[PDB]
C-alpha cells in the first residue's frame, strides 16, 4: 500500500508519462485521431482489416466444410422427411462428385440421424450455401457497410421420378404453386430486413429436346432479391449452414483410394466431426461478437477536438466528459482485434492435432478446382475446401502483423481515457 505518488512513480515510470499525456489536450487529440484511423482500418477497410479477415475466415470454413463433405453425404426421400420409392432430387450449383450438382436419390431408408439427409434439410442448407457463395463471389463489404445487398441470388433444384413430391410448393394461403409456370412471392427476415423471393415452377417433358435425363421433371427456381450482405447477415447464413449439417447429422461415406490425403473417419455421420463442427461454430460465434463491436465504435466518434473549455488551460478533472466515450471506443477496438485473433487460432492447423489437423491440412485448406474466383463451384470442388481457407489465415496474420502500431495506439488511448475517467469522478 503506497503512501504517495512519487514513491508510486519511482517504481512505475511509464505511469508518470501517462499522467503527463492525460493533461495535454494535444496528446489526447492525437490519441483520438489514432482511434479514428485504427477504426477506419478495422471497419472501413477490407483486405488490411483483421476484423474483415476473421469474418471472411469464419464464413469460408463453414462453406469449405460442406465443399469437402457434401458429395459423400447421403440424402434422399420425399417431403416432410419421408422415405421415397423412386424420388431423384437434384440441386444445381453444389459440389457433387465430378459434378456441379448434388443428386439426392437414396430411396427407401428413412431420412434422419446416421441416415439420409431429408430434402427439407438439404433445401435449408442449400439456400444458405447459395447465398454464401454468391456473396463470396461478389466479395464481402467492409464491416461498417452493413446496409448493402446482393441484387440477385438465384438457385434451382429439380425433382423427378414416380411419387417425387419435393417440388410441390405449399404457400401460406394453403394453395399449391401452379406446377407448369406458377410463380409466387415469399418473404423472410434477414438481419431485420424483409427479403422477397420469387419462387417459380417449370415442367419439362421426357421427350423435350436435350432433356438429358430422358425423364420428365419439375424445376424449382428461387430468385432472392436484395439479399443483405452485411457481416451479421452472412454469419447467420453460415450458422444455418453448419447447424443444419450438424442437427441433421446424416450418414456419409467417402472412398479414400491410394495416393492422396486420407479422410478419417472414411464413413460415419457428419456430426461425428465434433471437433471440426465445434470450431466452425465457435468461429461464427466469435465473429458475431466481433462485428457487434462495430456499433460501439460508431456510437462514439473521436473526431471532435477536445480543449480547455473556455480558452483557458486544460483541466483533466473537469474538462473530460468525452473520456467515457473514448474509453469505450478503444475497448471496442481492442476487443475486435482479440476476437479476430481468436477466430484464426481456432482453425489454424499450427495448433491442431490428430484427425482434426489432418482434416484442415488435408482437405479444408486445399482446393482441387483448376485459381478460380471465390464462390465458384466446379466439377472438382468436391472433397476440398475451395474457400481460400489457407490464403485467408495467411491474410489475417498479415493484417494483424500490419496492425502493430495501431494496436499500441489503441492501448495508449484506452489508458489515457481510463486515466481521465478516474480523475473525472470525485
Amino acid at each position, epitope marked *: 500500500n503506497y503512501e504517495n505518488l512519487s514513491k508510486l512513480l519511482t517504481r512505475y*515510470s*511509464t505511469l508518470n*508519462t*501517462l499522467i503527463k*499525456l492525460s493533461a495535454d489536450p494535444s496528446a489526447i487529440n492525437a490519441a483520438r485521431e489514432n482511434l479514428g484511423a485504427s477504426a477506419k482500418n478495422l471497419i472501413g477497410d477490407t483486405k488490411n482489416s483483421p476484423a474483415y479477415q476473421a469474418v471472411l475466415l469464419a464464413i469460408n470454413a463453414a462453406v469449405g466444410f460442406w465443399n469437402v463433405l457434401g458429395y459423400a453425404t447421403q440424402c434422399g426421400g420425399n417431403a416432410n422427411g419421408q422415405e421415397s420409392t423412386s424420388s431423384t432430387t437434384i440441386f444445381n450449383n453444389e459440389p457433387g462428385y465430378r459434378s456441379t450438382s448434388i443428386t439426392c436419390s437414396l430411396n427407401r431408408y428413412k431420412p434422419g440421424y446416421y441416415g439420409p439427409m431429408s430434402i427439407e434439410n438439404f433445401k435449408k442448407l442449400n439456400e444458405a450455401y447459395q447465398i454464401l457463395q454468391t456473396a463470396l463471389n461478389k466479395g464481402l463489404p467492409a464491416l461498417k457497410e452493413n446496409n448493402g445487398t446482393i441484387k440477385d441470388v438465384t438457385y434451382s433444384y429439380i425433382c423427378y421420378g414416380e411419387g417425387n413430391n419435393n417440388c410441390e410448393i405449399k404457400l401460406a394461403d394453403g394453395q399449391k404453386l401452379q406446377q407448369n409456370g406458377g410463380s409466387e412471392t415469399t418473404t423472410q427476415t434477414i438481419d431485420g430486413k424483409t427479403v422477397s423471393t420469387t419462387i417459380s415452377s417449370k415442367v419439362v417433358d421426357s421427350t423435350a429436346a436435350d432433356n438429358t435425363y430422358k425423364q420428365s421433371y419439375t424445376e424449382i427456381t428461387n430468385a432472392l432479391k436484395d439479399v443483405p450482405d452485411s457481416a451479421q447477415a452472412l454469419l447467420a447464413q453460415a450458422s444455418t449452414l453448419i447447424n443444419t449439417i450438424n442437427t441433421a447429422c446424416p450418414y456419409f461415406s467417402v472412398t479414400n483410394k491410394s495416393g492422396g490425403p486420407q479422410m478419417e473417419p472414411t464413413r460415419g455421420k457428419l456430426c461425428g466431426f465434433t471437433e471440426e463442427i465445434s470450431a466452425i461454430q465457435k468461429m461464427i460465434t466469435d465473429a458475431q461478437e466481433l462485428v457487434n463491436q462495430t456499433s460501439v465504435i460508431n456510437e462514439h466518434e473521436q473526431s471532435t477536438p477536445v480543449g480547455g473549455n473556455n480558452g483557458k488551460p486544460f483541466n483533466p478533472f473537469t474538462d473530460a466528459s468525452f473520456a467515457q466515450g473514448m474509453l469505450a471506443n478503444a475497448s471496442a477496438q*481492442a476487443k475486435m*482485434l*482479440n476476437l479476430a*485473433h481468436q477466430v484464426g*487460432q481456432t482453425i*489454424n*492447423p*499450427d*495448433n491442431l492435432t490428430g484427425t482434426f489437423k489432418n482434416f484442415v491440412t488435408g482437405f479444408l485448406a486445399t482446393c482441387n478446382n483448376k485459381g478460380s474466383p471465390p464462390g465458384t463451384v466446379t466439377t472438382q470442388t468436391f472433397a476440398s475446401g475451395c474457400a481460400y481457407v489457407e490464403q485467408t489465415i*495467411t491474410n489475417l*496474420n*498479415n493484417s*494483424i*502483423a*500490419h*496492425f*502493430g*502500431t495501431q*494496436e*499500441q495506439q489503441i*492501448q*495508449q488511448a484506452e489508458n489515457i481515457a481510463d486515466t481521465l475517467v478516474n480523475f473525472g469522478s470525485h
Partner: nanobody
Amino acid sequence: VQLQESGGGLVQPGGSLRLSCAASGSIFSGNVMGWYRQAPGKLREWVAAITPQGVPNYADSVKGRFTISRDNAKNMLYLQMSSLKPEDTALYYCNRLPNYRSWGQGTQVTVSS
C-alpha cells in the same frame, strides 16, 4: 504464457546487438510475434513483427537497420539490431500480436558515444 528477453547491453553508436526472446508455445505457436521498446519518457512503441510464415515488417524508425526472425522449432524470437543510434535506447520487449496482457521483464538496450 511466458516471455523472456535477453541479449541487451550498452553499446557505442554504430554497434549491433542480438536480442532473444524465449516464448512459451502457447504464446508463440501459430502466432504473429513482434518486438517492442519503451524509451525514457515515452510509452511502448511497436518496432517489428513477423508472421508464422516468416514475413517480417518494421516500423519506419528502424527499417533497414533491424531484422526480426523466428525459429519455429524452438519457440524463439530474435531481433538483429545494426547501426544503433542513441535514439534506440530503451527497454526492449517481445510479445505476440495481438498482445498477451502480461509482459516479460524486457532487456535494457543503452546506446551512448
